[PDB]
Each structure stands twice: as C-alpha cells, then as structure tokens.
Design a protein around this ligand. Structure first.
Ligand SMILES: *[C@@](O)(C(=O)OCCCC)[C@@H](NC(=O)c1ccc2n1C(=O)CN(S(=O)(=O)Cc1ccccc1)C2)[C@H]1CC[C@H](N)CC1
Lengths: 277, 9
C-alpha cells in the first residue's frame, strides 16, 4: 500500500532523530519527545465520560484501528468497554489539548476481540480490532502503519534488534508527558523473557527492554498499553508494527521486561475480521 | 484534558 511511509520523513527523504539507532542494530519511561509526524499511525483511545486517556492504539487502514484486548475487556478489574464508551483521537502530538485543525476524532462502529484472548491467566492473544464509524482522511499527521508478512517477521524479530514504542503514558512507575514520547528498545531472547517472570509466556508474545547490565533503560508505562511496537525494514524502508504494548510488571524495573502481543502470529485472525466485516 | 467538540460527547 502506501503504509509505513511517513509524509514528513520517508516521503521527503528526511530521517527522524533516532531511526539510525534501529537500523544500526539490524545486524513511556526514559524516552524523549516525539518529533511532529514521527508516528502518524499513533492513536489515542479516549473515554467519553469521564474524559480520560484509556490506552494507545494504531491506525492500520482508513477504517481500522488495532489495540490490546485488555484495553477494552478485563473482567478482574471490572473493565468492559463498548463502542459507545469510547472515542479514537488520531493525528495527535499534545497529550491533553484539542488540536484544532490537526487531529481527527472518530466514533466506533464495532469492536472485535480475539475469541481466544486469555484474560484469566496470561493475557495470551491480547489483541483487538476496532472499526471506525467513518473513514479517516490521511494527512501529514495521519498515516497507516504496515502489518508484517512472514518474511518481514522472520528477518526483523530477532534478539538484539531494536524496535520503537510510543505513547502518552506516565513517565515513571511511581507524571505524564505534555507531548507524545518515544523510546527505542531491543528485543530479548525468549529464555531471558521466561526466566524474568512467573507468568506463563506463549508464542503469541515477545519481550523487549534493556537487561540490567546494558546501562540504558526504558519501558512502556500506564497509559501506553495497546500502543504500537514498530520496526523499520532496512529492505523497503517502511515501518511495520511488530507488537502491541501488552503487559509488564511495573515500569522500567531492573530485571523485568516489557511484553508485547506478537502481531504476525495473529495476522490470520486480523485478515479474517477485516475480510469478513 | 481540554474539552473536545460537543459533537462527540
Ligand atoms: C497498560 O498501560 C494499561 O492497560 O493501562 C493503561 C491505563 C491508562 C492510563 C498497562 N497494562 C496492564 O496493566 C496489564 C493489563 C493486565 C495487567 N497488566 C500488566 O501489565 C501486569 N499485570 S499483573 O497482574 O501484574 C501480572 C499478569 C500478567 C499477565 C496476566 C495476568 C497477570 C496484568 C501497562 C502496565 C505497565 C507496563 N510496563 C506496560 C503496560
């Protein structure tokens, strides 16, 4: 499609300030302010009443938004949002202001949660799709991210390779940013991920983050859930969403990692919903 | 949060 090519960067042959870090590796707590138009697929899940940031999400077409199922449904915490409870805000930079003439707000038509989403035990298959009431118009600030194909997942989803997470979540586990934050994090070896937690991890998840010894740090935090973990393909220079911010024990704790929904493993379900609805 | 346009709430 035209996915993954940003109007203000790729289209104009301009690079953002940290994309080099990702490409050099190919072979939000402790993040920084995003540049304008740096993540044009970033979406804010916003509750109508009370008005509050619920979660992040991503734009994958003119009508479809991808997020974590737990952002909508999590029985242990009596959470169960329906279409009429939520609004999606697209094209934003500022966390709190209504960005007149820039952002677009949409109502939801339908919410689809993975039928085998495991909220009882380990958040396995933490994924959901949301169909917009009306198609959103693309712009310099609004543009869809690509979904990975088998070949892209295979070559990019490797330990040590860095991906990028963005969101308007808290800056510390223990305030909130004024603008969208960004942080680049390395994918971690599955054994290391398993050995960091008592939670049973599945092939539908992967973890990322720096190991205690690596010196650098960073993580998603409250308000970042549902947001995109993206990587930039060195082959075609497009941005692909490899993961969804799913769960993590605290934020940026030494010895703990962030866990992400594995988008490609659940791609078949994604195609079914869209092809069917 | 800044109030959003009434045509949504
Ligand atoms: C994420 O931002 C979110 O959903 O909250 C947004 C609030 C808007 C202001 C959030 N994710 C979760 O809280 C997620 C949902 C279920 C629980 N978690 C966890 O991350 C951790 N737990 S648990 O009970 O501690 C362990 C567990 C794990 C899996 C299944 C059952 C139990 C589950 C954030 C939290 C901070 C993190 N670094 C990023 C995601």
């Amino acid at each position: 499609a035209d996915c993954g090519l940003r109007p203000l960067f790729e289209k104009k042959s301009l690079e953002d300030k940290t994309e080099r870090e990702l490409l050099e590796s190919y072979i939000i707590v402790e993040g920084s302010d995003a540049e304008i138009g740096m993540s044009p697929w970033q979406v804010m899940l916003f509750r109508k009443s009370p008005q509050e940031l619920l979660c992040g999400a991503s734009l994958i077409s003119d009508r479809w938004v991808l997020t974590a199922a737990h952002c909508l449904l999590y029985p242990p915490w009596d959470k169960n949002f329906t279409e009429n409870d939520l609004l999606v805000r697209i094209g934003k930079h500022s966390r709190t202001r209504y960005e007149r003439n820039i952002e677009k707000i949409s109502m939801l038509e339908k919410i689809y949660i993975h039928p085998r989403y495991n909220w009882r035990e380990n958040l396995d298959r933490d994924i959901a799709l949301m169909k917009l009431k009306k198609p959103v118009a693309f712009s310099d600030y609004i543009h869809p991210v690509c979904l990975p194909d088998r070949e892209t997942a295979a070559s990019l989803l490797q330990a040590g390779y860095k991906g990028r997470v963005t969101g308007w979540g808290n800056l510390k586990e223990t305030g909130q940013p004024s603008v969208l934050q960004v942080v680049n994090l390395p994918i971690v070896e599955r054994p290391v991920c398993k050995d960091s937690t008592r939670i049973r991890i599945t092939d539908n998840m992967f973890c990322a983050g720096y190991k205690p010894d690596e010196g650098k740090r960073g993580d998603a935090c409250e308000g970042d859930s549902g947001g995109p973990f993206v990587m930039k393909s060195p082959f075609n220079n497009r941005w692909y969403q490899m993961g969804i911010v799913s769960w993590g024990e605290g934020c940026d704790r030494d010895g703990k990692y962030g866990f992400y929904t594995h988008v490609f493993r659940l791609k078949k379900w994604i195609q079914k919903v869209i092809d069917q609805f | 949060f800044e109030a959003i346009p009434a045509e949504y709430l």
